């Protein structure tokens, strides 16, 4: 029942008129991305963006992920253009091709990490552990906190996600619990496409 938007991938300069725009038309504009937020406006080209945290969390949430062009061209006219003509279509995972954003809000009855359990293990760079955990949770996944917190129950698939990028051994994991060990980029890639890429190329070689 509420319109609430958040911005991603702009300069302070460009953010200004998203603010001026917000107040003009009575739209709530928030600092950080929440669960009420229904709109993610972000910078494109005429409509491709860079992958931001808010980007992944927008697609994950099934939100409207609309370009910044929506604001520039609705001021250039006079009225509020309807975002539907302005939703993003890619980044550099997907070209302007595999429009994930659309795919997500349309396929909510059918989440991607549906029958899976995910441990976000170890250090991560510019995406806090819990923030990622939430991105996963939105896409049907169940989050686990230790490696020894995986379910006996047979219907479930254990998957350990690590960002190796931020360490200094992590081919280790496999020994401790027996579940596939994948780079973070598998989560990231899966949301951006909203498709759930198979584990093959994201699998981390392990030491027996």
């Amino acid at each position: 029942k509420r319109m609430s938007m958040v911005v991603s991938g702009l300069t302070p300069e460009e953010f200004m008129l998203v603010y001026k725009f917000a107040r003009k038309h009575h739209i709530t504009l928030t600092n950080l991305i929440t669960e009420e937020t229904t709109h993610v406006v972000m910078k494109t080209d005429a409509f491709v963006c860079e992958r931001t945290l808010k980007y992944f969390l927008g697609i994950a949430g099934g939100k409207w992920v609309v370009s910044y062009f929506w604001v520039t061209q609705s001021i250039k006219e006079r009225k509020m253009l309807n975002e539907h003509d302005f939703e993003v279509r890619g980044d550099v995972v997907n070209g302007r091709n595999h429009q994930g954003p659309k795919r997500a809000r349309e396929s909510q009855d059918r989440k991607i990490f549906r029958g899976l359990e995910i441990c976000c293990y170890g250090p991560f760079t510019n995406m806090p552990t819990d923030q990622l955990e939430w991105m996963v949770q939105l896409c049907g996944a169940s989050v686990v906190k230790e490696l020894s917190s995986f379910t006996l129950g047979t219907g479930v698939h254990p998957i350990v996600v690590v960002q190796p990028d931020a360490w200094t051994g992590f081919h280790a994991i496999g020994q401790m619990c027996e579940a596939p060990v994948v780079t973070r980029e598998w989560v990231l890639d899966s949301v951006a496409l909203y498709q759930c890429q198979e584990l093959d190329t994201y699998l981390i070689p392990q030491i027996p």
């Binding site: 860079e50 992944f56 550099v92 995972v93 995406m127 890639d189 190329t201």
Partner: peptide
């Protein structure tokens, strides 16, 4: 400074 981005796939 600004918002973090995320580069290439796997």
């Amino acid at each position: 400074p600004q918002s973090p981005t995320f580069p290439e796939a796997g």
